[PDB]
Amino acid sequence: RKLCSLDNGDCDQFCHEEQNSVVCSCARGYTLADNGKACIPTGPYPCGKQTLE
């Protein structure tokens, strides 16, 4: 297990391997955080989240 095969490469969502390196990305409506791994909602009711209010 290497890169994306090892715990999703530490990415919150999409993991891609480029030139022996992990590159993370996010679904539409999320922006990649400063650490280049976490996915942050841009607005209210982001996709894929159960609703709490």
Add this chain to the structure above:
Amino acid sequence: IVGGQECKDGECPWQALLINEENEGFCGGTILSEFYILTAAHCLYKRFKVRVGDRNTEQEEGGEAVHEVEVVIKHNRFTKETYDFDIAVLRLKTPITFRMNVAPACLPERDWAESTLMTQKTGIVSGFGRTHEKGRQSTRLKMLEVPYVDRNSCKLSSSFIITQNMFCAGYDTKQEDACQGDSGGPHVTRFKDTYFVTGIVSWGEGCARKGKYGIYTKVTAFLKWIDRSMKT
């Protein structure tokens, strides 16, 4: 849905219900965005609307909304005898206002979904369909965890062809499965508390029969097609 449990408040917000002229549900769908619904091509056989935000069809909650359909976009390669290319996208006349019990499911990227989502132990299917093969449809929205099934095993168990556009999920003997009226509805896969669309409820030889599984349209084979449909 045979077996499983009720979707609790806010748990299945991407569920849509296609309703006929008598306000009765005949098929499901998945909310993809404020303007688009994903469903099964076979469900499109004349005049119907789309209901969202419903969990109990016998009570007025206050979250429910009916939407008219502006355009029906059916896959042109859909075949009635095999149910191959069983996929359609609907554009609504007015946008859906997201709220409690009304939100979209995420579309994943193909490669990641196939290596990481479809290799998970289970997916989740949901609907207002029959609660057993020869019963009535449910007045309550239900959900069920369904294991991904090995592709070779599925082909061996099936009396009808399993194309490259289909995959199998469910149980060998346990009494849990999707059923009549669930067709066109969501099969989603959870990953780090985010739910991605992985399938469309398509067909099966009865409901929860021994040595038989649920057959779903393979969404990952249609991601470019879905993207094109949602632009024009």
